[PDB]
C-alpha cells in the first residue's frame, strides 16, 4: 500500500510523483503546486503602509 | 504616529522619538513549543517576566573610521540576570527576541548603520577562538566587514530580518526573531541560534565642533522563554 | 480560584502569528493599465528602506502603463525544479599504484562541501530537509571502461567500517551493498531525510562537544553532529590485486526539497571542507570593477 | 499630506517634500477641442505619452543681485523631443501645460521667488527682437522687473495663476494652464500664448558658508496636444 | 479587439473640468453674528499666501 | 499531472502524442489534424472573381 516517508510528508504543497517502490522516498519529484510570499521576505513589518502612503508618518 | 513607540516587557519600557517602525523576522511571532514538534518529555519552565524582559548590556563608540561589530545571541544574555541562571542550570533552552539598538545624534551629523539577524552566524579566518565565536557581552568586531569574516558579501545581507539608523531620519532600529533551529529546543551554553551585526555603511562624518562622542546601544528582550532539563549549573 | 494573571496569561502558544499568507502565483503579475496622476499626499515612489522593507511601488504609479497578460509561467524557479539536478559531490580514487588508497580498498566520509558547483547552491539556505537520488560512475583514469566488479557498502555512523578489501565487514548483513559491474550502467539510487534534526544544516554557529573549547579544540566549531551520515565504502570483489586502475564520481539529485533561512551567496573562494575560512590575505571584490562611477 | 505629492505623466515622474500644493489656471483642466469650437475639418493627432510627458530644460542660478527671467512655452518646448516635431511638422497646436519650477536650499537660508504665469506676454523696450520675444531654451532675463519690461506693475501680478517658493517654507511651486487663445488652434512656431516669469521679492541672503550655490530649475509638461495642419517640416 | 488602452483613455473630453461655479450675488455678501472662541486646531487667521 | 509546454502549445490542431515524462515536450510528435488554405498564398486578394468571370472587369 507504501509508506509515508518522503521529506516533504505532511507537506502543504501537493506533489503528484510516480513511485514503483514500497517507500514513497524512492517516488521521483514530479509536479508540485506554485505557491509564493513576497512579504515574508520583502514586507516582514509589523505595520503596513501602500505605495500611495509616505513610509514615515 | 509611526516614528513614536513603546516597548514594555517584564518591568521594563522603551521609548523613542524618531523610530522608523518595527520589523518581525520572517514574519512570525514568538510562539512557544507545541505539543508534538518537542520530544523532551517534562514540563518546562516558562519564567515570564523574571526572564522575558528589557536587558541593556554592551555599548560602542561610532566613528569615521569604525569598521563594525557583532554578537552572538544564545550566549550574549547568559551569566546576566534571571535569564543567564536558566540557561545554566538548565540544558534545554527556547525563547525569541526583540532587540532594539538605539543610537541617536543632531540634526548636522549624518550617518548610515546597518542592523541585520543572521541565523547560524559562522565565522572563518585555520579556525577562530572561544573568544571571537562566542564573545557574550561586549560582542567582538569586524575585520574585514566587506565579508562578513565569513567570506559571504554584505551587500546580499539585506536578505534578512534588518534595519537602518539613518541619522537624518531615525535614531533607532527594531527587530523582532522567533525561536530557529532544527530542534524544539538546544543548549544555549554551546550553541548560538544567530547573531547581530551592526556595520556603517555610510561613513559617520559631521562638521568639527559638534559633539564627537555618538555611543550605540544594545538592548535585548527574551520573549516566550521555556528551560528544559532541569540539572546542576554549568557555564559553557 | 484563578489569580486572574493565569487566566490573561497567553504563555504556552504553540500556534505562531503569521501576518504573512502564501499565494498561488503560477504566472507572473499581469500589468493594468495606468492613466497620468499628479495630486498631493499621494507619494508612491517616495519610501524610507530605513524600515526594512522592499519599496512596494508599482510600475503603473510610475509611469503611464499599458495592459499586460503575463503568461510567463513560474515552474522552473521552485525549489525541487532547481535542486533537483545531478552534481558531482564526491570522487574516490582506487589505484595501483601510490600512498593513496593501496590494499584495494576505499572508505569515504559523507560529505558534499567537497566541490564548488553544487556547494555555492546549497550554502543559499541556513536549513535544508530533503531526499536524493545517488548515481555511480566508475572508469580509469582515461576512460577505460573495465571488466571489473565492485561493491559500494554503505556505514551509517557507528557500524563497523572496513579496514581491509577483505574485512568482515563487508559480509553486509544488515547494512546496504550495492554490487555492479563497470560494463553495467551507473548506480541509481535513493535516499530519504535520515537525519536525529528536522532539517539538514548547512551552519552550525556552536560546538558539539559542550567541554572548554580550548585553542587545540577550536576544530569543533561549527561541526554538526546532525550532518554526520556516516561514511562510505568501496572495494573491488576479490582476495588478490584489482589488476586495474580505477576512480569512483559521485553524483547526487535532490527529490523533495525543502529549504529555509536564505543567506547571501558565497564572496570568496572556498578553502576548507565544513568551512567558512577564505582567503584573508587577499580578498576579491564581489564583481567586477570599474574605472569610474561616471563611465561606462 | 499636502505638502509631499507626486506628479506622473508619459513616462516622467516629479516628487516634492515641501511642495505648497497645486494651483489650476483658473480653475480649469486641459481640455481637448470640441467639434463645435474647432474649423480645422481633419482628424489631429494626439500622440499622448510621446509629447504630453515632464520635460526639464533651463535651469538659472539665483543670487542676492538677480533681476528675474522669463519664458515663452507655445515657443520653448519646440526643438526638443517629440512634442518640437509635431510642433514644426505640423501647423496647428493646441496644448495645455503643467509647469514645475523647483528650487530648493537649506533652513538657514531665506528668499521668496513669485513664479505666475502672464497670457500673451508681450514686451517693450523701439521694438524688441525676435531673441527678445522667443527666447526658447535658456530663456531671456528682465532688466526692469518692477515693470515687467511692459509696462506694467508687477505688483500687480499675483491677478493671475501664480504661486511662491518661500525658501523658509516650500522648495518648488506647480501651476496647472489650458489652452488659451481666441481660437481653437494655432501655430506656436509664431505666436506664444503666454510666458512664465520668475522674480525674486525677496533678496535671496544667507550668511557666509552656506552653499551659495542655489539653482532653479524649470520642468514642464504638454497635456492633451493636438496638432493639424500637417505639412513640411518647419522652423520658425 | 480592444486593446484595453484605447478604453481607458480620456483623450477627447472637449468638456473641461470647471470645479468652479458662478454663483448669484445682487446684493454684497451680509455679516452675520459672532460671538469669542478661543481653541487649538482652528487658525482662521494664519494663512499661506 | 504533466506540464504544458510543447510548442505547439494552445495549438488550433488536436495533437494525440503519448509521452511517459512530466514535461508535454517530452512527448512523440503523434497523430494530427489536417486542416488546409491554400488562398493564404494562391489568392490572397482582396476582391474574388472566380473561374467563370473574367479576373479584369
Ligand atoms: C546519505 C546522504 C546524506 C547527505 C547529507 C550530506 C550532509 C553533509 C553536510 C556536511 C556539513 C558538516 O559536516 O558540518
Ligand atoms: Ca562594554
Ligand atoms: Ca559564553
Ligand atoms: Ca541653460
Ligand atoms: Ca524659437
Known sequence: ?????????????????????????????????????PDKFANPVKDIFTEMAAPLK | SDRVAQLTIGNSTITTQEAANIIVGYGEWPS???????????????????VNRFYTLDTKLWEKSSKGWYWKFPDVLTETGVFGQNAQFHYLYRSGFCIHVQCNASKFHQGALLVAILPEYVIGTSHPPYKQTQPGADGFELQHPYVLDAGIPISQLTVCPHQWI??????????????????????????????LLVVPISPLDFDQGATPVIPITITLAPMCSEFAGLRQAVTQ | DRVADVIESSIGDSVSRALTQALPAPTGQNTQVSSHRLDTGEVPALQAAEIGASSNTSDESMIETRCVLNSHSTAETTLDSFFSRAGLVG????????????????????????????????????YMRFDAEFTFVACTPTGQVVPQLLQYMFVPPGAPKPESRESLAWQTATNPSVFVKLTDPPAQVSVPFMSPASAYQWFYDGYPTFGEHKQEKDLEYGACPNNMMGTFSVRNVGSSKSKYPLVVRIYMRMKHVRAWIPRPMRNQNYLFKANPNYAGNSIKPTGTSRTAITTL
Chains 1, 6 share one sequence.
Open chain 1, 1 to 37: 500500500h507504501e509508506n509515508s516517508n518522503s521529506a516533504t510528508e505532511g507537506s502543504t504543497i501537493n506533489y503528484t510523483t510516480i513511485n514503483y517502490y514500497k517507500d514513497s522516498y524512492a517516488a521521483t519529484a514530479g509536479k508540485q503546486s506554485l505557491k509564493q510570499d
Open chain 2, 32 to 50: 512557544y513549543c507545541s505539543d508534538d514538534d518537542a520530544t523532551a518529555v517534562d514540563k518546562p519552565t516558562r519564567p515570564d517576566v523574571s
Open chain 2, 166 to 195: 539613518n541619522l537624518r531620519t531615525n535614531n533607532c532600529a527594531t527587530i523582532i526573531v522567533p525561536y530557529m533551529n532544527t530542534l524544539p529546543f538546544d543548549s544555549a551554553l554551546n550553541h548560538c541560534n544567530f547573531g
Open chain 3, 91 to 126: 570522487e574516490i580514487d582506487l589505484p595501483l599504484e601510490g600512498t593513496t588508497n593501496p590494499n584495494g580498498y576505499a572508505n569515504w566520509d559523507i560529505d558534499i562541501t567537497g566541490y564548488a558547483q553544487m556547494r555555492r547552491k546549497v550554502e543559499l539556505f541556513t
